[PDB]
RNA sequence: GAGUACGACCACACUUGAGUGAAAACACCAUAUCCCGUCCGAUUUGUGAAGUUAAGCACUCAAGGCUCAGUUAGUACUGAGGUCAGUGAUGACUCGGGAACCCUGAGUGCCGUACUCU
RNA sequence: GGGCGGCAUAUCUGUUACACGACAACGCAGGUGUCCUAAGGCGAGCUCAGUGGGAAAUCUCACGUAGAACACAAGCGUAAAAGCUUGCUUGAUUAACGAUUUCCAGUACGAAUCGAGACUGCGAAAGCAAGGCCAGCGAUCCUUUGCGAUGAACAAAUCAUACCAGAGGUGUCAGAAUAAUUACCACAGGGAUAACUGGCUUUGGCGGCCAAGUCGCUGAUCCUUCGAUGUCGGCUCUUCCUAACCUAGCGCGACGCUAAGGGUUGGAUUGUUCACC
RNA sequence: CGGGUAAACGGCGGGAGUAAUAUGACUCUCUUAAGGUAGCCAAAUGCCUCGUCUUCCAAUUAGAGACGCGCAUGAAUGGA
RNA sequence: CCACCGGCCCCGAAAAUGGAUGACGCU
RNA sequence: GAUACUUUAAAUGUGCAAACAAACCGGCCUUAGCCAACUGCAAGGCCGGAAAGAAAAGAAUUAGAGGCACCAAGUGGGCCUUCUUCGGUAAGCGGAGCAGGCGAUGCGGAAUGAACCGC
RNA sequence: GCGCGGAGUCCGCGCACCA
């Protein structure tokens, strides 16, 4: 049995890109995302990058440059305690809140905060975004999800809806939202609203308490004595808190 | 019967010289260019011609005054 | 080569114009008329003595023909002719 | 005589360098090209859309037209007794910005800086001297240059 | 002095074998009523936080590779010249240009935007 | 030379080819007149050829820079793909006479590149797609089909014709409708071209020289001659050469050196030269 | 489409293999419209070829008589 | 006094009308 | 590899530029162009400034007047040489690349020779 | 291309022929 990785194997070997070897970036998709019309002589174009870790969610607005990407503005789901959310980070409701927080900070920085108020009312409805590609036009960015799989109900789309309701232009169809039915080809705003406000979390929490009454899941809720029938209200209050103080961050 | 060669051809081509290319600023037509930019440039040129006519009239009036 | 029997497209032609079905037919040349101008001229040239007065083509080399399809939709009456590549068989079925 | 196609005899011309395969990069995508710029036309063998003919593979020209994905370039080509100006259309993967005028632009910039300093009254740098003048040479080592028995 | 997210150049960054890892983070890890997907909750998707640096990761340390110099060497080859030498193959000379493998010496990523910890 | 054979007659890849481009031979090695409603378009998931360890071709784990595949020849290219499986589809449609490349006279045809408008497909989106990258094809006139003015003294309905876009074909592929023979033979020309001498080169002959392979001394071309250089053999007659058969001398029965002065025959069969008695 | 006709034009193989040292009376196969019969021959017809044997001469690629694996003899395209 | 390498010269070196460093000649 | 295909890689080449319809520095006008928007970017113009008119460092030279038409002849059998070469055993043989010649040309040399040497 | 038969496909027959 001759060895494979012999002397002649290394001389003819070409290494892949650094981030391809680390398995972080899909360069084929990145090229199509950063590409722009050459007749638009380098006018600004923006990505909404969403990355979900094990214990946090990350969302930033990025413009690409030769020297390296620059971040216009970033928001993290881990600072939502400063607005009134705890014990329930990295879920669909926190995704919605993260998106809305990012949009509010971005419009506030770019100075168009009063215009494009977004949707002060919360609903899992669909409304096609207004774009020149089709009155002052709304600030626009395209969604970047990375290597994540784009299945119906995934949290990347909840993050997206957060910004859309915050008042951003992100082109999209409502085909990957939780309430969508593929065979009938329609969306259920009631179901989407339920997932936005976190009814399923409350149902699971009630079930686990009722079952564990006899003789590790949801341990922090059970320990801190969080009660059902308040989760929707807590999220609804957090939304107003953000729209009042978009920058109130974690202390010190 | 079917001969081919390039033997005397460079000598023939250099008697009246290889002429240089036409300068870039002559024969600079835009036909076949990307259409939207062409359409905008035409409108700008029309406005410029109107301005040139007005400027000549003003110069003539000023000279008549003094 | 196999071609589907039915195809979806608009086919406006002063009617519904929406993407609906088509009825597909294969073009076949009509019969040559006895009173076409050119046929009358050839007959007048050929009468009398002298033999054959025009060339007759003999040295065929092509083994195939181009296929022409006629497409027509319901209501909208117009016909559209389309050309395909050269082929030897051209079945007109949709079984897959 | 027998075969003369569009890509005939391009075996070594349209090939990638050793251990340098792959596809264009974001630096190529993010490059801005304007009408009037000098560019080099170099065929990228991994794209295959909008590739120029092999004659234009090493030439430099002027951009005359920009489209959403293409560039139009003017390139001189001698034919018999004259030089033609040919207009070729390519994808943006197959061009590069030319550095054929860097020295001239640098000369103009240095002239402007010199004019600014001379008007300001600042002291000018000391001008370089010639290397072909005479002088006294003080040697450190002297040797004997010779052809010796051991040399052969 | 570190970490994470997005990155430009794409081995001085790779492959193999070991040791160390403050706090933060990242990650393994628990689970399957709901959204979603499989022969299989393996992969993927949702909801979590008991445990762990064992692995991933980062740093450091020894070999193949890679990168930059030196030698090989004014050698091989080559533009120009002769009523040059040789039966010839070929060779030297005159005015110019000038390598490669092998061998050997050194090192083993670097530069940006945003937010965080000691 | 011509005939026979063949296609070097349209057309692609590697070489010939001499580090821009261009570059020939009945030069070399190979291909093409088709095939595909998917083998076209797009999104997603996945990784191939092969090797090693296991389990009464298949199941399992590790490695695996492409060593497989991409209809067909070859070359380039490609790894969360341009390959494989799968879901949905018809951009293989239409496209106001836009511009351009290759061949090139800077004409056409075939192929190809960059576009603007319509109507659409796939995708969450940015995007991608007007066939399968690069060989796979065709004038005038005539016939025929699709689409929306004329028949001159007026009008109606038929019929014929016209503008525009396709289809039926010319493979000798920038495109006549084409079988033999002449020794009974003809004309205008050609040494631009064969059959005979001569020239060049090889042939086959033919034994030598050192040592025991080596180193020397018929064909193929087409230069002259087609307003003509009389084509085999024998007879007759002269002359020259040596690589010595006899005659003359030497050295060792045979072998070698000098020597071209003199000589080298009569017949049967065959047109024979040769050959054989 | 069916018949007839060779002193109409013409044709008379593709062939193989077996058997009493030889050989083949003897057998088997392939196969046609039919498969060369009576005769004749290295003939004005035989490539190989100056075929082989006998005769003719001192000596015969010539002549004659025989033989027949007949490149490619043969019956009014007339055979002897 | 040996083994090898040079410079000139000599063998190796044989044809067909009488004849050619251009001729005569030159040491 | 087989038992010449190739990482490396010349000499001789080859494309572009090197200040007077060009480019550099600041106003302003216009666009039913790009961008969330414009005091940014794209394009066409107008008003001003500067100008060793291209220094020094080996830092060009010219028997160096640019461009544009019209009308028409002969030719479309070539051959030789230098350095590369493909076919062929070889040829005063066939086929090619770059340059110079003869053809179309004498004169002075190589005794003589279309093409050698000098001119 | 047009008519007959016999199993739009094929098979025979006899006819037609300006890209
Ligand atoms: Mg379009
Ligand atoms: Mg006709
Ligand atoms: Mg001749
Ligand atoms: Mg006989
Ligand atoms: Mg006699
Ligand atoms: Mg006899
Ligand atoms: Mg002449
Ligand atoms: Mg002369
Ligand atoms: Na003399």
mmCIF file of N, CA and C (backbone and C1' of nucleotides) in Angstrom, chain B residues 1-7 10-11 19-20 22 24-26 30 34 36-37 39-41 43-45 47-48 55, chain I residues 17 21 29-33 42-47 66-68 77-81 95-101:
data_model
loop_
_atom_site.group_PDB
_atom_site.id
_atom_site.type_symbol
_atom_site.label_atom_id
_atom_site.label_comp_id
_atom_site.label_asym_id
_atom_site.label_seq_id
_atom_site.Cartn_x
_atom_site.Cartn_y
_atom_site.Cartn_z
ATOM 1 N N UNK B 1 1.256 23.409 -58.964
ATOM 2 C CA UNK B 1 0.463 24.450 -59.605
ATOM 3 C C UNK B 1 -0.079 25.483 -58.615
ATOM 4 N N UNK B 2 -0.264 25.081 -57.365
ATOM 5 C CA UNK B 2 -0.847 25.947 -56.346
ATOM 6 C C UNK B 2 0.262 26.344 -55.376
ATOM 7 N N UNK B 3 0.927 27.444 -55.683
ATOM 8 C CA UNK B 3 2.031 27.952 -54.888
ATOM 9 C C UNK B 3 1.521 28.970 -53.884
ATOM 10 N N UNK B 4 2.191 29.041 -52.743
ATOM 11 C CA UNK B 4 1.879 30.041 -51.734
ATOM 12 C C UNK B 4 3.176 30.507 -51.097
ATOM 13 N N UNK B 5 3.323 31.819 -50.925
ATOM 14 C CA UNK B 5 4.450 32.366 -50.184
ATOM 15 C C UNK B 5 4.137 33.799 -49.786
ATOM 16 N N UNK B 6 4.862 34.285 -48.783
ATOM 17 C CA UNK B 6 4.747 35.657 -48.309
ATOM 18 C C UNK B 6 6.012 36.468 -48.580
ATOM 19 N N UNK B 7 6.777 36.079 -49.596
ATOM 20 C CA UNK B 7 8.170 36.500 -49.699
ATOM 21 C C UNK B 7 8.318 38.015 -49.878
ATOM 22 N N UNK B 10 5.878 42.014 -47.228
ATOM 23 C CA UNK B 10 6.233 43.088 -46.305
ATOM 24 C C UNK B 10 6.920 44.242 -47.031
ATOM 25 N N UNK B 11 7.780 43.919 -47.996
ATOM 26 C CA UNK B 11 8.400 44.952 -48.812
ATOM 27 C C UNK B 11 7.355 45.764 -49.567
ATOM 28 N N UNK B 19 0.273 53.143 -42.592
ATOM 29 C CA UNK B 19 -0.306 54.368 -42.073
ATOM 30 C C UNK B 19 -0.755 54.176 -40.633
ATOM 31 N N UNK B 20 -0.582 55.214 -39.827
ATOM 32 C CA UNK B 20 -1.023 55.193 -38.456
ATOM 33 C C UNK B 20 -2.527 55.279 -38.342
ATOM 34 N N UNK B 22 -6.299 56.555 -37.223
ATOM 35 C CA UNK B 22 -6.964 57.861 -37.127
ATOM 36 C C UNK B 22 -7.010 58.294 -35.665
ATOM 37 N N UNK B 24 -8.105 59.633 -31.955
ATOM 38 C CA UNK B 24 -9.288 59.216 -31.207
ATOM 39 C C UNK B 24 -10.417 60.229 -31.295
ATOM 40 N N UNK B 25 -10.103 61.508 -31.474
ATOM 41 C CA UNK B 25 -11.140 62.527 -31.423
ATOM 42 C C UNK B 25 -11.921 62.669 -32.722
ATOM 43 N N UNK B 26 -11.481 62.061 -33.816
ATOM 44 C CA UNK B 26 -12.234 62.092 -35.059
ATOM 45 C C UNK B 26 -12.995 60.789 -35.252
ATOM 46 N N UNK B 30 -21.403 57.590 -31.698
ATOM 47 C CA UNK B 30 -21.958 56.870 -30.563
ATOM 48 C C UNK B 30 -22.968 55.808 -30.960
ATOM 49 N N UNK B 34 -24.922 51.914 -25.425
ATOM 50 C CA UNK B 34 -25.991 51.582 -24.491
ATOM 51 C C UNK B 34 -27.073 52.653 -24.504
ATOM 52 N N UNK B 36 -30.005 53.908 -22.906
ATOM 53 C CA UNK B 36 -30.500 54.954 -21.987
ATOM 54 C C UNK B 36 -29.574 56.152 -21.824
ATOM 55 N N UNK B 37 -28.266 55.915 -21.742
ATOM 56 C CA UNK B 37 -27.322 57.020 -21.615
ATOM 57 C C UNK B 37 -27.334 57.891 -22.859
ATOM 58 N N UNK B 39 -29.890 58.365 -24.841
ATOM 59 C CA UNK B 39 -31.126 59.138 -24.847
ATOM 60 C C UNK B 39 -31.011 60.345 -23.924
ATOM 61 N N UNK B 40 -30.384 60.177 -22.762
ATOM 62 C CA UNK B 40 -30.197 61.327 -21.876
ATOM 63 C C UNK B 40 -29.251 62.372 -22.477
ATOM 64 N N UNK B 41 -28.146 61.916 -23.070
ATOM 65 C CA UNK B 41 -27.180 62.849 -23.633
ATOM 66 C C UNK B 41 -27.808 63.697 -24.730
ATOM 67 N N UNK B 43 -30.879 64.874 -24.902
ATOM 68 C CA UNK B 43 -31.630 65.967 -24.297
ATOM 69 C C UNK B 43 -30.701 67.061 -23.787
ATOM 70 N N UNK B 44 -29.591 66.663 -23.168
ATOM 71 C CA UNK B 44 -28.638 67.663 -22.689
ATOM 72 C C UNK B 44 -28.101 68.500 -23.847
ATOM 73 N N UNK B 45 -27.776 67.854 -24.968
ATOM 74 C CA UNK B 45 -27.237 68.587 -26.110
ATOM 75 C C UNK B 45 -28.256 69.562 -26.696
ATOM 76 N N UNK B 47 -30.639 71.171 -25.011
ATOM 77 C CA UNK B 47 -30.649 72.342 -24.137
ATOM 78 C C UNK B 47 -29.415 73.214 -24.365
ATOM 79 N N UNK B 48 -28.257 72.584 -24.576
ATOM 80 C CA UNK B 48 -27.029 73.345 -24.792
ATOM 81 C C UNK B 48 -27.113 74.200 -26.054
ATOM 82 N N UNK B 55 -27.009 83.075 -25.912
ATOM 83 C CA UNK B 55 -25.771 83.791 -25.623
ATOM 84 C C UNK B 55 -25.341 84.656 -26.800
ATOM 85 P P A I 17 -0.781 54.837 -27.609
ATOM 86 O "O5'" A I 17 -0.129 55.535 -26.340
ATOM 87 C "C5'" A I 17 -0.909 55.903 -25.214
ATOM 88 C "C4'" A I 17 -0.047 56.378 -24.072
ATOM 89 C "C3'" A I 17 0.901 57.523 -24.378
ATOM 90 O "O3'" A I 17 0.252 58.782 -24.315
ATOM 91 C "C1'" A I 17 2.031 55.843 -23.144
ATOM 92 P P A I 21 -4.386 70.546 -30.276
ATOM 93 O "O5'" A I 21 -5.856 71.158 -30.254
ATOM 94 C "C5'" A I 21 -6.519 71.450 -29.032
ATOM 95 C "C4'" A I 21 -7.941 70.933 -29.002
ATOM 96 C "C3'" A I 21 -8.116 69.528 -28.433
ATOM 97 O "O3'" A I 21 -9.344 69.469 -27.707
ATOM 98 C "C1'" A I 21 -9.016 69.608 -30.608
ATOM 99 P P C I 29 -26.137 76.999 -10.763
ATOM 100 O "O5'" C I 29 -26.320 76.765 -12.327
ATOM 101 C "C5'" C I 29 -26.996 77.711 -13.139
ATOM 102 C "C4'" C I 29 -27.112 77.233 -14.563
ATOM 103 C "C3'" C I 29 -27.880 75.941 -14.771
ATOM 104 O "O3'" C I 29 -29.279 76.145 -14.795
ATOM 105 C "C1'" C I 29 -25.871 75.882 -16.014
ATOM 106 P P U I 30 -30.275 75.044 -14.189
ATOM 107 O "O5'" U I 30 -30.310 73.901 -15.295
ATOM 108 C "C5'" U I 30 -30.605 74.205 -16.648
ATOM 109 C "C4'" U I 30 -30.324 73.028 -17.538
ATOM 110 C "C3'" U I 30 -30.825 71.698 -17.020
ATOM 111 O "O3'" U I 30 -32.197 71.491 -17.290
ATOM 112 C "C1'" U I 30 -28.597 71.470 -17.761
ATOM 113 P P U I 31 -33.051 70.517 -16.354
ATOM 114 O "O5'" U I 31 -32.586 69.065 -16.792
ATOM 115 C "C5'" U I 31 -32.771 68.610 -18.119
ATOM 116 C "C4'" U I 31 -32.269 67.204 -18.276
ATOM 117 C "C3'" U I 31 -32.657 66.250 -17.168
ATOM 118 O "O3'" U I 31 -33.974 65.772 -17.315
ATOM 119 C "C1'" U I 31 -30.368 65.978 -17.698
ATOM 120 P P A I 32 -34.900 65.565 -16.025
ATOM 121 O "O5'" A I 32 -35.249 64.017 -16.068
ATOM 122 C "C5'" A I 32 -36.316 63.486 -15.307
ATOM 123 C "C4'" A I 32 -37.159 62.581 -16.155
ATOM 124 C "C3'" A I 32 -36.399 61.808 -17.218
ATOM 125 O "O3'" A I 32 -35.778 60.641 -16.714
ATOM 126 C "C1'" A I 32 -38.260 62.844 -18.210
ATOM 127 P P G I 33 -34.535 60.003 -17.499
ATOM 128 O "O5'" G I 33 -33.291 60.271 -16.544
ATOM 129 C "C5'" G I 33 -32.847 59.273 -15.642
ATOM 130 C "C4'" G I 33 -31.512 58.701 -16.048
ATOM 131 C "C3'" G I 33 -30.791 57.922 -14.960
ATOM 132 O "O3'" G I 33 -31.232 56.582 -14.876
ATOM 133 C "C1'" G I 33 -29.298 59.462 -15.939
ATOM 134 P P A I 42 -17.588 60.417 -11.780
ATOM 135 O "O5'" A I 42 -18.754 60.144 -12.824
ATOM 136 C "C5'" A I 42 -19.021 58.828 -13.279
ATOM 137 C "C4'" A I 42 -20.094 58.808 -14.335
ATOM 138 C "C3'" A I 42 -19.964 59.832 -15.445
ATOM 139 O "O3'" A I 42 -19.021 59.452 -16.427
ATOM 140 C "C1'" A I 42 -22.193 59.781 -14.682
ATOM 141 P P A I 43 -18.102 60.558 -17.133
ATOM 142 O "O5'" A I 43 -19.095 61.291 -18.136
ATOM 143 C "C5'" A I 43 -19.744 60.570 -19.170
ATOM 144 C "C4'" A I 43 -20.871 61.360 -19.787
ATOM 145 C "C3'" A I 43 -20.520 62.733 -20.328
ATOM 146 O "O3'" A I 43 -19.911 62.676 -21.602
ATOM 147 C "C1'" A I 43 -22.525 62.862 -19.090
ATOM 148 P P G I 44 -18.795 63.748 -22.013
ATOM 149 O "O5'" G I 44 -19.629 65.012 -22.492
ATOM 150 C "C5'" G I 44 -20.674 64.875 -23.440
ATOM 151 C "C4'" G I 44 -21.464 66.147 -23.584
ATOM 152 C "C3'" G I 44 -20.666 67.435 -23.616
ATOM 153 O "O3'" G I 44 -20.077 67.660 -24.886
ATOM 154 C "C1'" G I 44 -22.549 67.697 -22.210
ATOM 155 P P G I 45 -19.008 68.832 -25.130
ATOM 156 O "O5'" G I 45 -19.831 70.173 -24.901
ATOM 157 C "C5'" G I 45 -19.207 71.329 -24.373
ATOM 158 C "C4'" G I 45 -20.219 72.278 -23.793
ATOM 159 C "C3'" G I 45 -19.665 73.556 -23.189
ATOM 160 O "O3'" G I 45 -19.352 74.546 -24.152
ATOM 161 C "C1'" G I 45 -21.217 72.605 -21.701
ATOM 162 P P C I 46 -17.999 75.401 -24.021
ATOM 163 O "O5'" C I 46 -18.362 76.540 -22.974
ATOM 164 C "C5'" C I 46 -19.439 77.436 -23.205
ATOM 165 C "C4'" C I 46 -19.758 78.240 -21.970
ATOM 166 C "C3'" C I 46 -18.592 78.945 -21.301
ATOM 167 O "O3'" C I 46 -18.209 80.151 -21.936
ATOM 168 C "C1'" C I 46 -19.862 77.842 -19.663
ATOM 169 P P C I 47 -16.696 80.671 -21.799
ATOM 170 O "O5'" C I 47 -16.571 81.110 -20.273
ATOM 171 C "C5'" C I 47 -17.314 82.206 -19.765
ATOM 172 C "C4'" C I 47 -17.078 82.389 -18.288
ATOM 173 C "C3'" C I 47 -15.638 82.626 -17.870
ATOM 174 O "O3'" C I 47 -15.222 83.966 -18.058
ATOM 175 C "C1'" C I 47 -16.596 80.992 -16.470
ATOM 176 P P G I 66 5.432 64.681 -43.054
ATOM 177 O "O5'" G I 66 3.892 64.348 -42.814
ATOM 178 C "C5'" G I 66 3.437 63.908 -41.547
ATOM 179 C "C4'" G I 66 2.075 64.454 -41.191
ATOM 180 C "C3'" G I 66 0.880 63.874 -41.925
ATOM 181 O "O3'" G I 66 0.481 62.611 -41.437
ATOM 182 C "C1'" G I 66 0.685 66.211 -41.856
ATOM 183 P P G I 67 -0.052 61.477 -42.441
ATOM 184 O "O5'" G I 67 -1.465 62.013 -42.935
ATOM 185 C "C5'" G I 67 -2.549 62.140 -42.030
ATOM 186 C "C4'" G I 67 -3.631 63.054 -42.549
ATOM 187 C "C3'" G I 67 -4.445 62.560 -43.731
ATOM 188 O "O3'" G I 67 -5.427 61.606 -43.376
ATOM 189 C "C1'" G I 67 -3.870 64.822 -44.064
ATOM 190 P P C I 68 -5.797 60.411 -44.380
ATOM 191 O "O5'" C I 68 -6.733 61.091 -45.471
ATOM 192 C "C5'" C I 68 -7.795 61.952 -45.097
ATOM 193 C "C4'" C I 68 -8.378 62.648 -46.296
ATOM 194 C "C3'" C I 68 -8.604 61.773 -47.508
ATOM 195 O "O3'" C I 68 -9.775 60.994 -47.389
ATOM 196 C "C1'" C I 68 -7.610 63.805 -48.180
ATOM 197 P P G I 77 0.009 32.755 -62.526
ATOM 198 O "O5'" G I 77 1.252 32.832 -63.517
ATOM 199 C "C5'" G I 77 2.592 32.959 -63.056
ATOM 200 C "C4'" G I 77 3.312 31.634 -63.022
ATOM 201 C "C3'" G I 77 4.770 31.703 -62.570
ATOM 202 O "O3'" G I 77 5.083 30.541 -61.800
ATOM 203 C "C1'" G I 77 4.652 30.676 -64.678
ATOM 204 P P G I 78 4.517 30.350 -60.311
ATOM 205 O "O5'" G I 78 5.803 30.277 -59.387
ATOM 206 C "C5'" G I 78 6.674 31.380 -59.237
ATOM 207 C "C4'" G I 78 7.796 31.358 -60.244
ATOM 208 C "C3'" G I 78 9.160 30.907 -59.736
ATOM 209 O "O3'" G I 78 9.327 29.500 -59.789
ATOM 210 C "C1'" G I 78 9.382 32.957 -60.890
ATOM 211 P P C I 79 10.031 28.685 -58.601
ATOM 212 O "O5'" C I 79 11.580 29.035 -58.713
ATOM 213 C "C5'" C I 79 12.389 28.510 -59.753
ATOM 214 C "C4'" C I 79 13.659 29.304 -59.928
ATOM 215 C "C3'" C I 79 14.627 29.311 -58.755
ATOM 216 O "O3'" C I 79 15.445 28.155 -58.698
ATOM 217 C "C1'" C I 79 14.316 31.516 -59.524
ATOM 218 P P C I 80 16.013 27.607 -57.299
ATOM 219 O "O5'" C I 80 17.191 28.603 -56.915
ATOM 220 C "C5'" C I 80 18.428 28.602 -57.606
ATOM 221 C "C4'" C I 80 19.332 29.704 -57.111
ATOM 222 C "C3'" C I 80 19.737 29.650 -55.647
ATOM 223 O "O3'" C I 80 20.805 28.757 -55.405
ATOM 224 C "C1'" C I 80 19.080 31.847 -56.206
ATOM 225 P P U I 81 20.924 27.986 -54.005
ATOM 226 O "O5'" U I 81 21.383 29.099 -52.959
ATOM 227 C "C5'" U I 81 22.663 29.703 -53.027
ATOM 228 C "C4'" U I 81 22.782 30.898 -52.110
ATOM 229 C "C3'" U I 81 22.576 30.651 -50.626
ATOM 230 O "O3'" U I 81 23.733 30.123 -49.999
ATOM 231 C "C1'" U I 81 21.402 32.599 -51.288
ATOM 232 P P G I 95 7.655 22.774 -55.169
ATOM 233 O "O5'" G I 95 7.219 22.814 -53.636
ATOM 234 C "C5'" G I 95 6.036 22.165 -53.199
ATOM 235 C "C4'" G I 95 5.819 22.273 -51.707
ATOM 236 C "C3'" G I 95 5.924 23.651 -51.084
ATOM 237 O "O3'" G I 95 4.792 24.457 -51.348
ATOM 238 C "C1'" G I 95 6.984 22.066 -49.691
ATOM 239 P P A I 96 4.889 26.053 -51.256
ATOM 240 O "O5'" A I 96 4.893 26.339 -49.689
ATOM 241 C "C5'" A I 96 5.750 27.310 -49.115
ATOM 242 C "C4'" A I 96 5.795 27.181 -47.615
ATOM 243 C "C3'" A I 96 6.450 28.332 -46.875
ATOM 244 O "O3'" A I 96 5.591 29.444 -46.707
ATOM 245 C "C1'" A I 96 7.344 26.315 -46.080
ATOM 246 P P G I 97 6.160 30.943 -46.778
ATOM 247 O "O5'" G I 97 6.875 31.157 -45.376
ATOM 248 C "C5'" G I 97 6.143 31.209 -44.166
ATOM 249 C "C4'" G I 97 7.044 31.469 -42.982
ATOM 250 C "C3'" G I 97 7.919 32.705 -43.059
ATOM 251 O "O3'" G I 97 7.227 33.891 -42.730
ATOM 252 C "C1'" G I 97 9.209 30.874 -42.331
ATOM 253 P P C I 98 7.401 35.202 -43.633
ATOM 254 O "O5'" C I 98 8.792 35.821 -43.172
ATOM 255 C "C5'" C I 98 8.962 36.385 -41.884
ATOM 256 C "C4'" C I 98 10.402 36.756 -41.621
ATOM 257 C "C3'" C I 98 11.093 37.615 -42.668
ATOM 258 O "O3'" C I 98 10.768 38.995 -42.583
ATOM 259 C "C1'" C I 98 12.521 35.841 -42.034
ATOM 260 P P A I 99 10.602 39.878 -43.917
ATOM 261 O "O5'" A I 99 12.083 40.117 -44.447
ATOM 262 C "C5'" A I 99 12.968 41.010 -43.793
ATOM 263 C "C4'" A I 99 14.411 40.724 -44.134
ATOM 264 C "C3'" A I 99 14.865 41.041 -45.551
ATOM 265 O "O3'" A I 99 15.097 42.421 -45.778
ATOM 266 C "C1'" A I 99 15.700 38.933 -44.914
ATOM 267 P P G I 100 14.866 43.079 -47.226
ATOM 268 O "O5'" G I 100 16.158 42.685 -48.065
ATOM 269 C "C5'" G I 100 17.460 43.006 -47.603
ATOM 270 C "C4'" G I 100 18.522 42.242 -48.354
ATOM 271 C "C3'" G I 100 18.496 42.377 -49.863
ATOM 272 O "O3'" G I 100 19.060 43.596 -50.309
ATOM 273 C "C1'" G I 100 18.793 40.110 -49.278
ATOM 274 P P G I 101 18.853 44.100 -51.817
ATOM 275 O "O5'" G I 101 19.847 43.188 -52.655
ATOM 276 C "C5'" G I 101 19.616 42.933 -54.024
ATOM 277 C "C4'" G I 101 20.175 41.607 -54.450
ATOM 278 C "C3'" G I 101 19.852 41.206 -55.877
ATOM 279 O "O3'" G I 101 20.752 41.772 -56.808
ATOM 280 C "C1'" G I 101 19.376 39.408 -54.425
#
